[PDB]
Design a protein around this ligand. Structure first.
Ligand SMILES: N#Cc1ccc2c(Oc3ccccc3OCCn3ccc(=S)[nH]c3=O)cccc2c1
Lengths: 520, 389
């Protein structure tokens, strides 16, 4: 017998009350048959007319087996119920699973009909099975056991299973039991001979506490197909991914394609989806057809080529240290690889650039490092030792000049194309013997005598070409001044592209701000 | 006897989510919490309690033993407005003028006093699991929480009874209790202050009060190039808002027009006198008793961090500068963390409140790296969002 959890309605809300619309004769015959069987087993107990609460029943014949089953809509009952700690919604990532000699999948059977329910709350879960016409008011039933579809069934069953499994985990500490939904995943380092005995002992424990489990013969054998992951004995791979070859492409098709490619990126290295997501920028009808641009077609060709090869990941041995490599890609794509030993990869991924944002490659690298750090914390619990393209001196220059606070875990320098380094290379002091420049948002006034926010950007660009290699400029606008300051090597905007192209060649360019002043 | 604790009218308890933590922190929290439950301070809760409050493990005074900080800010926003109005804590003003002020942690006392049965449920915390292996072990605080404002309010009667003999013996000592901290301030010399603090520690320990040093006495040749005068007039326009007597119109006339950036310009006489008058002008501290103090941290680089505490903008109540102090470790996260702690302690000794912080760092970086370098029980309300300085 399992102790019940105290559950109550939300403060100030009465029990559900809904009326049951009439149903056909075949449906009521099936419903009374199944309900009488359940009452004989004991899940539902008939209650008299004292209870005024009703929750309607809808009879459905599932296409398989041609049998009429019962589905009760508890939506109203779910609304009129105390809040419960949401069950964890993140599936265990296969990368963090430490390899064990034998692993079994024990799927508990009819669990929500085995964990019981609180006596006070049994009253509101009353459903009516109508009689033919109005000869009798009908049959009235209540639920002694946890209903299906109720808000709190997952949390209550999870707590019940945890309490039942706790003493077994205390007695046998080597066995590791993962819980996800109803199933219990059990893994022990023991040989198969003792492991079968231990799994039988777990089954008998759950049977003495009332939870049925599958038999020894019916337990699944490797490989396992779980939430899109194929878990082999010594490798984890995503399920076979078939990219659609449809010539026509709808917004829904592109959404599915991007979702599939993002799911594939976790093991497949080099999957690029940036162009497709740019195709999906704006809202459109799912029937609306967006033609594949040339850039997106190139992206889909390279992605399909990558998906042709099979790639497999490896599980986690805690002794060795995690190592993360970030490899630069075109534009703002950043492919990151996590591997404990070389050429065997635990997980691959991508960091897409901030949509509609132009930033320095070093700042994008910093964001990528932070994303890797948080993902590694969540999955494994330790931050990796990074291996980054950027040179230490470039990082130090940007770190000291930048106004925010940026830190990166222990990292080292890997030599590979491309290498991230600063391009603007601005200085902070005026140059003697160099032309001194004034800009006003496209006119230029000069010591030599030579004579809206984007306009200042245009004006500050015009300053560079005229002056030459060594320049000293002052700008009337802090916006253009900040654009040149930010050292944006992304070159997303066209005007900024022009400015960077002209700036890279120059040997020494220093720019300062002069406020507008009363008088000449 | 349990005292009635009530949330503010029409406010729901905390539901905040928990931040994933490292395996070492999870193991330390698990062992600490298991021992604490065996002692009786925390007890298990099932799924019927939805409320949650984060748990962070910090290492104190670079010692081996881990400690636990429960970020009870969301619960404090609701409960303290009930308890502080109902019970309150007076603030001594002499702590500013005291030559020496010391902080003694007092958290062990709250581990003895019980708590209201109904209010227990709103103090719930979870210890996360790596890779979603198991649902987190959830707990509730049966005994008075450590780090939740209102625990000093509930324990104030006992604290007064426990400090009355010592305060009667020593009239000059000034003692003020923010949450889990006692501020002892003496005008005596520093050695005598050490002796008095030792005497206070012995007194508290003998009365069953277990406990484990900022100095308040100690606000901040060649004619210049044309662009240098431009830099000065830029600072003029910047500081026009801060002080009204500041004036620009005479240094401006020197740089008016197009000039060479390396040109050497002698000052006009009126411009030089105007520079002197501006300096004289440079050379609204009215603290609103009820306001949200906000402190802005500005990274000047080179291991220097300037802060400004102000209630309404352009009326600074205090300005200062903090310099880097560790040559072995240079990370901006740690430097910002120590800046925040020092600013908060100075604010606590000067006025009652702990400021809201506008931090320069970015959101995820702070969220990932604050717990490693935090060394204080209190947790201020920070906005990771920064403004470009
Ligand atoms: N379908 C299904 C399914 C089956 C097992 C799962 C699982 O098993 C473990 C359970 C406990 C510890 C380690 C585990 O896995 C180690 C790694 N591992 C994985 C597979 C094999 S065959 N052998 C092996 O060593 C953990 C999480 C999800 C699971 C889903």
């Amino acid at each position: 017998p399992i102790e019940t959890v105290p559950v109550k309605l939300k403060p100030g809300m009465d029990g559900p009350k809904v009326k049951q619309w009439p149903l056909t004769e075949e449906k009521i015959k099936a419903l009374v048959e199944i309900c009488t069987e359940m009452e004989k087993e004991g899940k539902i107990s008939k209650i008299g007319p004292e209870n005024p609460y009703n929750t309607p029943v809808f009879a459905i014949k599932k296409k398989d087996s041609t049998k009429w089953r019962k589905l009760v809509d508890f939506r109203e009952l779910n609304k009129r119920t105390q809040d419960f700690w949401e069950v964890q919604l993140g599936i265990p990532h296969p990368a963090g699973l430490k390899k064990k000699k034998s692993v079994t999948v024990l799927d508990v059977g009819d669990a929500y009909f085995s964990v019981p329910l609180d006596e006070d709350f049994r009253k509101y879960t009353a459903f009516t099975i109508p009689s033919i016409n109005n000869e009798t008011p009908g049959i009235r039933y209540q639920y002694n056991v946890l209903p299906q579809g109720w808000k709190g069934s997952p949390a209550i069953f999870q707590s019940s299973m945890t309490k039942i499994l706790e003493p077994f985990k205390k007695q046998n500490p080597d066995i590791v039991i993962y819980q996800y939904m109803d199933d219990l995943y059990v893994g022990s380092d023991l040989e198969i001979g003792q492991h079968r005995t231990k799994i039988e002992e777990l089954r008998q424990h759950l049977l003495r506490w009332g939870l049925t489990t599958p038999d020894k013969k019916h337990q699944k054998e490797p490989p396992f197909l779980w939430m899109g992951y194929e878990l082999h004995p010594d490798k984890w791979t995503v399920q076979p991914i078939v990219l659609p070859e449809k010539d026509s492409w709808t917004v829904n098709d592109i959404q599915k394609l991007v979702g599939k490619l993002n799911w594939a990126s976790q093991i497949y290295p080099g999957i690029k989806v940036r162009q497709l997501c740019k195709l999906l920028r704006g809202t459109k009808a799912l029937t609306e057809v967006i033609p594949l641009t040339e850039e997106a077609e190139l992206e889909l060709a390279e992605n399909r080529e990558i998906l042709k090869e099979p790639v497999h990941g490896v599980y986690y041995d805690p002794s060795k240290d995690l190592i993360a490599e970030i490899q630069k890609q075109g534009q703002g794509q950043w492919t990151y690889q996590i591997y404990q030993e070389p050429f065997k990869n635990l997980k691959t991924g991508k960091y897409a650039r901030m949509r509609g944002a132009h930033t320095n490659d070093v700042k994008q690298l910093t964001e990528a490092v932070q994303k890797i750090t948080t993902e590694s914390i969540v999955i494994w619990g330790k931050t990796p030792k990074f291996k980054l393209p950027i040179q230490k001196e470039t990082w130090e220059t940007w770190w000291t000049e930048y106004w925010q606070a940026t830190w990166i875990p222990e990292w080292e320098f890997v030599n590979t194309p491309p290498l991230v380094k600063l391009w603007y290379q601005l200085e902070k002091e005026p140059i003697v013997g160099a032309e001194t420049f004034y800009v006003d948002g496209a006119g230029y006034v000069t010591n030599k005598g030579r004579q809206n926010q984007k306009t200042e950007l245009q004006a500050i660009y015009l300053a560079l070409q005229d002056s030459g290699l060594e320049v000293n400029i002052v700008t009337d606008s802090q916006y253009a001044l900040g654009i040149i300051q930010a050292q944006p090597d992304k070159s997303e905007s066209e005007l900024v592209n022009q400015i960077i192209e002209q700036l890279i060649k120059k040997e020494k360019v220093y720019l300062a701000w002069v406020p507008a002043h009363k008088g000449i």
